[PDB]
Every structure is written in C-alpha cells, then in structure tokens.
Design an enzyme around this catalytic site. Structure first.
Site, short mmCIF file in Angstrom:
data_model
loop_
_atom_site.label_atom_id
_atom_site.label_comp_id
_atom_site.label_asym_id
_atom_site.label_seq_id
_atom_site.Cartn_x
_atom_site.Cartn_y
_atom_site.Cartn_z
N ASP B 11 5.80 -5.28 -2.38
CA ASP B 11 4.46 -4.85 -2.77
C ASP B 11 3.57 -6.02 -3.18
O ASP B 11 2.62 -5.85 -3.96
CB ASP B 11 4.51 -3.83 -3.92
CG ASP B 11 4.96 -2.46 -3.45
OD1 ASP B 11 4.56 -2.04 -2.34
OD2 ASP B 11 5.70 -1.78 -4.20
N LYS B 14 3.28 -9.71 1.58
CA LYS B 14 3.88 -10.73 2.44
C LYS B 14 3.68 -10.40 3.92
O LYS B 14 3.48 -11.30 4.74
CB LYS B 14 5.38 -10.85 2.15
CG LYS B 14 5.72 -11.28 0.73
CD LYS B 14 7.23 -11.40 0.52
CE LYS B 14 7.93 -10.06 0.75
NZ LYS B 14 9.41 -10.15 0.54
N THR B 15 3.72 -9.11 4.26
CA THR B 15 3.55 -8.68 5.64
C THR B 15 2.10 -8.74 6.09
O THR B 15 1.82 -8.98 7.27
CB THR B 15 4.09 -7.24 5.84
OG1 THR B 15 3.85 -6.82 7.19
CG2 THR B 15 3.43 -6.28 4.88
N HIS B 74 14.45 -7.43 0.50
CA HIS B 74 14.92 -8.50 -0.37
C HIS B 74 16.36 -8.88 -0.04
O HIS B 74 16.77 -10.03 -0.23
CB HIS B 74 14.83 -8.05 -1.84
CG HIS B 74 15.05 -9.16 -2.82
ND1 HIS B 74 14.17 -10.21 -2.95
CD2 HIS B 74 16.04 -9.38 -3.71
CE1 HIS B 74 14.61 -11.04 -3.89
NE2 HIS B 74 15.75 -10.55 -4.37
N1 LIG Z 1 -6.04 -4.34 -3.27
C1 LIG Z 1 -5.15 -5.01 -2.46
N2 LIG Z 1 -4.02 -4.41 -2.07
C2 LIG Z 1 -3.15 -5.00 -1.18
C3 LIG Z 1 -3.41 -6.32 -0.70
N3 LIG Z 1 -2.40 -6.64 0.15
C4 LIG Z 1 -1.58 -5.61 0.27
N4 LIG Z 1 -2.00 -4.57 -0.52
C5 LIG Z 1 -1.42 -3.20 -0.66
O1 LIG Z 1 0.00 -3.29 -0.96
C6 LIG Z 1 0.64 -2.14 -0.34
C7 LIG Z 1 2.05 -2.47 0.22
O2 LIG Z 1 2.05 -3.85 0.61
P1 LIG Z 1 3.19 -4.40 1.64
O3 LIG Z 1 2.42 -5.51 2.23
O4 LIG Z 1 3.68 -3.15 2.54
O5 LIG Z 1 4.52 -4.95 0.89
P2 LIG Z 1 6.07 -5.18 1.34
O6 LIG Z 1 6.12 -4.52 2.82
O7 LIG Z 1 7.03 -4.78 0.28
O8 LIG Z 1 5.80 -6.64 1.91
C8 LIG Z 1 -0.28 -1.53 0.75
O9 LIG Z 1 -0.65 -0.20 0.34
C9 LIG Z 1 -1.56 -2.45 0.69
O10 LIG Z 1 -2.76 -1.66 0.52
C10 LIG Z 1 -4.63 -6.97 -1.16
O11 LIG Z 1 -4.89 -8.11 -0.80
N5 LIG Z 1 -5.47 -6.29 -2.01
#
Ligand SMILES: Nc1nc2c(ncn2[C@@H]2O[C@H](COP(=O)(O)OP(=O)(O)O)[C@@H](O)[C@H]2O)c(=O)[nH]1
Ligand SMILES: *C(=O)[C@@H](N)Cc1ccccc1
Lengths: 205, 371, 82
Positions: B11, B14-15, B74
């Site tokens: 969260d 990174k993606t 992770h």
């Molecule tokens: N407000 C905000 N939210 C973000 C940003 N980048 C990612 N998110 C939120 O983070 C959430 C999950 O992020 P994700 O990239 O899937 O994380 P991971 O897959 O665990 O790498 C999504 O609902 C995005 O809306 C950002 O730059 N600004």
RNA sequence: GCCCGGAUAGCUCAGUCGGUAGAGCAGGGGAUUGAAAAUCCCCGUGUCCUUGGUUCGAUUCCGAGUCCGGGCACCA
RNA sequence: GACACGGUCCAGACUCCUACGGGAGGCAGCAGUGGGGAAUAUUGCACAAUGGGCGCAAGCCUGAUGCAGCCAUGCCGCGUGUAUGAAGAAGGCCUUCGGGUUGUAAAGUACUUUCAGCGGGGAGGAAGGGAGUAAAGUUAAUACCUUUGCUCAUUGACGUUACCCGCAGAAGAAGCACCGGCUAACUCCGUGCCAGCAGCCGCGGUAAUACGGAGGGUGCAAGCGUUAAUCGGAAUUACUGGG
RNA sequence: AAUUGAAGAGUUUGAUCAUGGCUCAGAUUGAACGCUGGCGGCAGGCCUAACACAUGCAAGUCGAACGGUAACAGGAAGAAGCUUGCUUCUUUGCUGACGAGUGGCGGACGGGUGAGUAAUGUCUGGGAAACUGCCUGAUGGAGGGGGAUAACUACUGGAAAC
C-alpha cells in the site's frame, strides 16, 4: 567512377604533363616530378610490348578520367562509325560535357569541371543537365545557371583560360559566359601530343 | 541497461511508481506504456524449483535501456535479494509520505545490504494528500536514519518527492519529478522467445511473451540471440489462433516471421528493436550460493567453474573469473566474480538469470556490470 | 472475329501503343495478321505524335472487323475532315 | 522439448563394479651425406571433454552442460 | 470448337472427413510451405491504363495486365567533393643511416552541393463514361433512338511519384585481386623442401622479386576475384582452311 | 548511308628445327560462393523433384429471356404512439434492383510447365477431297398449336455428401 585520390602520381607515372592540377600556379614544380613514380620507382623501366600498348592506354584514361568499361563502350561506338576508328575515338572523347567546359575555361581543372556539371549549375540550351558524359550536339550553346552564375569559383577560372589555347572547333563568349559549339573537333586541332595509333591495338587482341 | 527495483511496503505505491516510469518515458523518449493490470498480476515462473512471482518492466532512456523489477508480495522480495532470482542494481526505495518508513521498508534496506545491492535511489511516494513543509522534512529525515546504519552514505543518495497516481494518468505538473527520478538512475521494444513452431503454408511461427514495445504487422524487426543474428519483418501476430494486430507488452502471443527456416531460431533468442542493442560476452556479477539441504551445494567450487546461466529464455554456459581474494566460494557467500560468456548475447546490468549445474539448483546472482 | 485493337509496348512507367489488327481470341501482344500505324500518348510536344494508316483500316472493316473504343477515338483524333 | 551411444596422449582402442592411466601404428631428437635412405645411439609428448559430489582416494560410481552421431515429438 | 488446368464417369497411388455405411481433393494459375538443392523473392495494391468475358448500356469479374515490395543477378547513369596546401611534419617503411619514400597525400584555409535526410510546390500517363442541351437524321411526332459540337461534376493503383524550389553541413557513402615469366606493378622481416603457394613452366633444402605479414606500387570499381559452362585461341576434325 | 574485317606466348631437349598434345591471355552466363556494399533507371529471378501440398484467391455475367422476390431500398393501402400526419408499422412484386432456379453466352480464351516425342511434332514451300461460333456483305422469311420440368409447397432418406 572517378579516382578521388593522390591525382598527381599519374603525371609521375608517365612523365607527360596531364594538367590535372593547372590551378593558380603556372608550372607545378612542387611534386618532385620525373624521378618519383613510387618508392622503388628509381629502377629503370623494362618497356615491354604489352606495356607500350598499355602505357598510353591508361594515360589517355588518366587524362579524361574515364572508366574502363566506359572507355570500352566508347571504343566500340567508335568502331561502328565512318572512317578511321582511331580518329573516331578522340572526337567522341572530346564530346564529353565537362571536357568542353574545360575547353571553354569555365572549369579550372577537369575535376573542377565535373564538380560543376554534377551540381546542376551548368546549363545547355536553357536546360539543366547533370550527366558529365553528355555527348554535345553540333553547334549548340552551353552556359551557367543564373542563381549560381559566377559564384567566386568560376570567377577565378575565367582568368586561367586567357593563358590557354582556346581551340578552333568552338567559341566562348566570356561576356555572359556562353560556351557555344561549332564543327566536330579535328585530330589536327587538338594538343597532338597523344598517339591513338597504339590505343586501337590494345583492344584488337 | 541497469535494472532497478521498487523495494518497500504494501500500500505504498510501488506498482504505480513502476507504472509511472514506464509510461511517461515511453511518450517523450520511446518504448511502450504499460497497463496497471500487468504490473499488479505478475506471472508465475518456476525458478530452480521454487516458484517466484516477479514482473520485469522495461523502458527506454536516451543513454541506455533501463530494466525494472517489481514484486507484488513481501514474501517474493525475500527470495529476490537473499538469493537473487531477479537481478537488480538500483533498488528504488519506495517510502510513503502519508505513513512514513515502516518495518517492512526498513528490512529491504538491510536485506540489500547483507547481499550487496550497491545503489538505492529513493523516491518518496503518496505526497498528494499531506501539505506541510515540516512534514516533508520529517519523513525525509526518517529515511536518512534508515540508510546510514546499513553502510549507505545518506549525503549523496538523492531524494525525489512525488505521487505516482497522477504520474500514471497524465498530469504534466508531476511528470517532471518522474523524469529526474530516471535521470538520477543514470548517475546512481524487446521480446523474449519461449516457443517456436512452423505451420504448413505460413512459415516460421515464434511464440513468447512481450516485455516491452508495441507490435505492428509489417514492420522491420531484428533478432538477437546466442547464435548468428539475422533480420526479419512482422507478418502476423496471433493469440489462441485468433488474430490480434496490436501486440502490447505482457501478452504471451505468437508472431509470424518472414523468410526464415525452422533451423535458425531456437530457445534463447530475443526479438529486439532495430539498431538498439549490441551483444556482450564479458560482464560482471555478484552471486549467492545456497545450501545442499535447501537445493544448492555444501562444498565450494574453484576458479574455472563454469555453470549454466538461464537468462529469461536461455541455458547458456559461461566461464567464471573469480576475483582476487576469492578462491573457494562456499555455500552462503554473497561475493562477486567476472563472467565471460562463450556466445555474443544482449547482456545488461540487471537482466535476471538462474544458475544451474548438475541438472539442478546451485545459486542465483545479481548482474552488476558489463566489462 | 478479327478486331482492331492496341498493343502495349515500350517499358514500365513509359508506355507505347502500336495499334494492330488481330483476333479477339489472342493475347494482347499475341499473334496478329497485320499492324497498321501506332500511337504514342506520352511522347512529347513535337511534330510527330500519332501515325494512323486509315486506308488499310477501312480495308479491314469492310471485311467485317470491329474497331475498339480507344482505337476509334484515334480515328476521330486524326480528324477525317481536317 | 525428451531419451541412449561415443567425448581415453596425433590417431584406433585396452584397463572399471574406487587406489596416483597402458599399448600399437606413429612421429621425432642426434652421427654420417650437398640432403635423405640404410645403419647406430635414445625416447611418451596424457587437462581421461568441461565441472562437481559420496572423499585417505573417481578414467571407472551418481550427475549435468556442450560438441557429434542416432531415434521421437509438438503444430500460434 | 475440348476428346478439355480451376468439367464428368472409372481404376490405381498419395492425403482427408467419418455418426465407419459412405463420401471429398489435385498450386506444372498469383503468392506461400515442406523437402530437394551449390542457388533463385511478398500469403502486397488497383482494376487508373491495354486487352479478355457477359450485357443495348450502365456496370461487374479480371493473380491476364499495370505497378509495388525483395535480390548487386546483369547492363547502364551517377556519388563518395573541388581549389589551395612543404616544416616538404608525425607515424609507417626502406636505407650507402646522407636521405629517400608514403606525399599535395593529410592537417589548416577558401568555396560548392548531385544523390540522400527534412519541408513545401507539382506534370503527364485521361481516352471516355454519367446527367444536361443544340442541330441533323428517323417518324404520323417538336416524342423515342442515333450521330456530331458544347457545358457541368469529375475518374489515378503507383504516389510521402517524374520533375522543380528551398534548408543544413564536407556533411551519410570504397573496397576486391595482384605484384618470378607468360602479363601491367617491389623491397624488407619472420618461417627454412617445414608451414604453404599453384592456371601452366614450376617455387620453398637458412640470402624466397613466387610461402605468411608489413610498407609501397599495380589492375578494376560498387563492384572485384574464384568456381561451374560454351565459343574463341585450336589450321589440335582443316568446306572456307591440314596431312 | 546501312557485315571499315583475323595478334600470341610458355612447355619435350645439353642446344636446334620440326611434328604434336597440354595451359594461359578474351568475351559470355537464367549463375553460385568468398568479401565488400551509397542512390537510381531498365531487364531477369526454381536450371534439381513433371516431387507432395495448408489457406485465401485465380471466370463469371445478363431482369432488354422467364417464373419468382428469399433479402435491401421506395411507393401504395393501412395501422398506432400521439408533436392530427411527427412516427410506429402489418400486408403488397406495383417499381428500382436482386440470392436460389430455368435458359442463353463464356468456360477450348487468357496463365503455367517441358514430362513425353526423332516424326502422329516443328520449320520451309506448295496443295485439295473440308469445317468455320462471335463480326460483316447480299436475297427472302419471321404463320400456327400442344405436352412437361427446375425454382416453389407437403412429406421424407442421409453424419456429411447428396
Ligand atoms: N492518494 C494517493 N494514493 C495512492 C498513490 N499511489 C497509490 N495510491 C493508492 O494506494 C492503493 C494501493 O496501492 P498499490 O500500489 O496497489 O500497493 P501494493 O500493490 O501493495 O504495491 C490504491 O488504491 C491507490 O489509489 C498516490 O500517489 N496518492
Ligand atoms: C498461441 O496460441 C499463442 N498465441 C498462445 C500460447 C498458448 C499456449 C502455449 C503457448 C502459447
């Protein structure tokens, strides 16, 4: 198809002046002529039978800057003409566009003359022609394109023609710089220091 | 090239940061814009017995052609560094501005330290919700304390702030920070061949998953491999025997070529972009050797030990030049060596490969340099 | 049936047409009995552009030969009056 | 993509159910002769293909990679 | 009109579908694939042009054709710039170690710009046809139909054409065989009848103009050599023109 | 204006002249290979297996021949929403045109290959005992009736083909 190299090694190979580097100097002299054909050019020549035919054959080609295939094509085209085949040679070889430009004086050197014919600056009968091997038709005019007329190079070339022969088979204006043509060039009217006698024999075998 | 990797927390973004660099560098420089679906859902690949889940992203830079690895879990990052499945050099530290440095982000800096990942270019993500200058300096300060303790100089490692969500949509005001992110990667079309066929009446049918670029039918394409390189042209792209013209990255489609016999294209080749990559036979790598009970060996090897490197579609053998001081590489080492290959092939500082010998697992490494 | 048609000669990107008299069951450059004049649609603005030997043509129509559309257009191009 | 046989000093092969590798045809280094032959005086020059393990010890035991030869696939 | 390339019936062989009874097929047509082989290209575009088939015509089909793509396969044109430039340099090489040579070659300097790359103008290949309309034939008719002028809107696969203008900067463009005689053009070093050369005569046995390299020069040129093949040379199948 | 056209050397031997083969000097090629490789114009590009073939395509057209009209687009009668003609829209061959069928015409042209063939062929020059759709010249005719069938319905065999 040209040489594009140390084009004065040719004059030292035969000894006869080819005028390939007329330029701004009267006589070259900064070439160490007559005693330096190559690194081992100090050794006296054998002057062989096949060589005597060859040595003047290559010499005329080194003068006109013509390809051997192109020379052979002009040879057989001269073979199918009227009269002496040897005489048929020099008439057509004096028909090459840039060579007439060289005789007109618009080209300082033949290399400079062909560098102008290739760059669409030359014009015959109000037509821009780019082929250097364009056989000139009897009695026609040849001039320079207006928007590139007298652009510092051919300007220097006009003074050079004053010390040249300016043959009797054509007529140069030099006022509007027009290269007009007359009757076909005669063998007795050219430099006459070349022997076509041997040239006809080399392709006979 | 140099391969980078988004190391961080779940969260964090990174993606979307991986999606930030690949899309906007494909509009002003070149390459292909990637969809959010392929960066999240990574395909499964059996690496030396244990299945890993990684996503290899690539984009073009004016100087080189940088790669990028990104794992959705992770648990996959534990295998990524301590063993070296996906070879990485410029580990991009992804720290959120909303949350800050958390225990999972702290571990990746220690996990890269003990192994030998030299470069870490930090990019602080998710800074579009909080607006406080004192808070911008506080999260940046917790990061500098998180790198100095693991033998990394915090005075020369660059810090770039930003938000990867709008860096994916197209808002130009945030795009300048993604370009200097890749610019700092400088200081601190490609297609792997997985299967080949030849149907009666068409010619040579090559299959493989696209890593980068957009494929059109009727364009000039080049082929780079360990064998004699040749040239060809696209004459058709098919998926499940169904026509698909626009071939995009991530799609494991089959392509049709022009004028090549079956005996010239095999497993280990790569359809590349014309006049963009040269072959390498000399490069450098830092490896890890695992234990006998977990798959590897239990005794060290000598200098001259030439194992087989399986890089993304190959099984090429290469001779090893062990460095000075290193004579016997025992299981558990995280040391380096200079690798010399017997075949001219595209080797970049980050292309991933598995190292096998004896027909089984031996170890894995991280390509650091190309000599 | 004997027909009066054209014959594409010359070269690619520089056509030529030698109007001939042949059979409808033959090739374009196929077997013919007699050729009558020619046609040069891309020659030049000069003294010669198209030569049509009308007399021989009228000799063939009386036999029962049918003229082609492009061929008949040349007959009006020769302007029977002037 | 998968499965066997050869990978043994220049060359053809022997030797193995762990124990510091042989033979034959060679070829060659010297005296003599303008030079060889004949004659006489003397000889292995080997990463057992590469690499590793069960190690007092592996050519041979179990494995793989690659080259060569020999069999079958699969059909975007 | 065939005793029929894209038709029929029959037999055989090679494949194929199969509900197992019974059926289907013929790239030596354009492409294309396997295989063969020393070796030979895209599953392109349009019916604009010529021609072929049908139809009154309009149109429709046209892998005939017209073009494009691809290959230096051959011929032919052309380009890789020109003028100036001697301390007659560095470096390479040879050397009677004096010097010569590479060599006006290059660098430096002054000009020009074909063809390419970029951006705009722009032929011809086009003749017709469709609709409208005038006149003259035809007729009972100013109708219908036909023919001959004319008007309108136009019809181009190639096609970011041919060709022309302009911009930028010498800027993007040279190798291949040979070098004893035949047959144009040389020395040195290393290897010593060893390695190798080779069309023929023949070279190499420790001083090789012939082996390998280096420098130089020579032949030809986007081609150069080699191999296979024919003729010539061969008056060595001679009728021309021998014994 | 129209065939203005012919070169030799080496090698047998101690040496020579002979006879006499062998080799090279040239031109060419439906070419291949090695190497290198800038653009363009015009030609040519499966010589071996006349070996086997995936798929698309390569010859169809005519309503000015006829019954029909299964579709598409109008007209016309009508019908329903409702902005009373704005639309929805069911019948209808009444028209433009048109799948499938009948009939006419082409399919024997055009395109490719060189396997076969030593004379049933080809080439050259003649010949008589022939036929000739399509087009064209000339003279006449073009009168009057009947019986079936495909398409289409009903049923139905067959996996398909049919
Ligand atoms: N407000 C905000 N939210 C973000 C940003 N980048 C990612 N998110 C939120 O983070 C959430 C999950 O992020 P994700 O990239 O899937 O994380 P991971 O897959 O665990 O790498 C999504 O609902 C995005 O809306 C950002 O730059 N600004
Ligand atoms: C062919 O269908 C490919 N486009 C997809 C594929 C399917 C299965 C295995 C390999 C490739």
């Amino acid at each position: 198809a040209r040489y594009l190299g140390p084009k004065l090694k040719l004059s030292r190979r035969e000894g006869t002046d080819l005028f390939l580097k007329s330029g701004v100097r009267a006589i070259d002299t900064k070439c160490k002529i007559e005693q330096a054909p190559g690194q081992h050019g100090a050794r006296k020549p054998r002057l062989s039978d096949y060589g005597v035919q060859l040595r003047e054959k290559q010499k005329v080609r080194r003068i006109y800057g013509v390809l051997e295939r192109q020379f052979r094509n002009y040879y057989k085209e001269a073979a199918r003409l009227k009269g002496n085949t040897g005489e048929n040679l020099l008439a057509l070889l004096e028909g090459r566009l840039d060579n007439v430009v060289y005789r007109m004086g618009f080209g300082a050197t033949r290399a400079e003359a062909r560098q102008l014919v290739s760059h669409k600056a030359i014009m015959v009968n109000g037509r821009v022609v780019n082929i250097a091997s364009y056989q000139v038709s009897p009695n026609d005019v040849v001039s320079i394109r207006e928007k590139a007329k007298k652009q510092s190079r051919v300007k220097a070339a006009l003074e050079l023609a004053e010390q040249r022969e300016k043959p009797t088979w054509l007529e140069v204006d030099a006022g509007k710089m027009e290269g007009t043509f007359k009757r076909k060039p005669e063998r007795s009217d050219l430099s006459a220091d070349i022997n076509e006698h041997l040239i006809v024999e080399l392709y006979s075998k | 090239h140099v391969n980078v990797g988004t190391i961080g927390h779940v969260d964090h973004g990174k993606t979307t940061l991986t999606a930030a660099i690949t899309t906007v560098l494909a509009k002003t420089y070149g390459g292909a814009a990637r969809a959010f679906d392929q960066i999240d859902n990574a395909p499964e690949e059996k690496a030396r017995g244990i299945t890993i889940n990684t996503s290899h992203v690539e984009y073009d830079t004016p100087t080189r052609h940088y790669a990028h690895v990104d794992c959705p879990g992770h648990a996959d990052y534990v295998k990524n560094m301590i063993t070296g499945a996906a070879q990485m050099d410029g580990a991009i530290l992804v720290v959120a501005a909303t949350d800050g440095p958390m225990p999972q982000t702290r571990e990746h800096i220690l996990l890269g330290r003990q192994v030998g990942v030299p470069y870490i270019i930090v990019f602080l993500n998710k800074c579009d919700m909080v607006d406080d200058e004192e808070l911008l300096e506080l999260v940046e300060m917790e990061v500098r304390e998180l790198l100095s303790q693991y033998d990394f100089p915090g005075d020369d490692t660059p810090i770039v702030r930003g938000s990867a969500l709008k860096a994916l949509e197209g808002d130009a005001e945030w795009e300048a920070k993604i370009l200097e992110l890749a610019g700092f990667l400088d200081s601190y079309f490609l297609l792997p061949i997985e299967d080949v066929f030849s149907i009666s009446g068409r010619g040579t049918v090559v299959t493989g998953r696209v890593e980068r670029g957009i494929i059109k039918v009727g364009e000039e394409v080049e082929i780079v491999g360990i064998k004699e390189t040749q040239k060809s042209t696209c004459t058709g792209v098919e998926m499940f025997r169904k026509l698909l013209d626009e071939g995009r990255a991530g799609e494991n489609v089959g392509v049709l070529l022009r004028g090549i016999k079956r005996e010239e294209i095999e497993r280990g080749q790569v359809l590349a972009k014309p006049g963009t990559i040269k072959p390498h036979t000399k490069f450098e790598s830092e490896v890890y050797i695992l234990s006998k009970d977990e798959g590897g060996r239990h005794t060290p090897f000598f200098k001259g030990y030439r194992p087989q490197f399986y890089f993304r579609t190959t099984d090429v053998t290469g001779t090893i030049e062990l460095p000075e001081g290193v004579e016997m590489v025992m299981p558990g080492d995280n040391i380096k060596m200079v690798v010399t290959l017997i075949h001219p092939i595209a080797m970049d500082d980050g292309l991933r490969f598995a190292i096998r010998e004896g027909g089984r697992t031996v170890g894995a490494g991280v390509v650091a340099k190309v000599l | 049936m004997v027909t009066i048609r054209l014959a594409r000669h010359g070269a690619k990107k520089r056509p030529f047409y030698q109007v001939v008299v042949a059979d409808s069951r033959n090739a374009r450059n196929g077997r013919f009995i007699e050729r009558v004049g020619f046609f040069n649609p891309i020659a030049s603005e000069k003294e010669e552009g198209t030569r049509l030997d009308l007399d021989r043509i009228a000799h063939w129509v009386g036999q029962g030969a049918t003229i082609s559309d492009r061929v008949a257009a040349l007959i009006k191009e020769v302007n029977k009056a002037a």
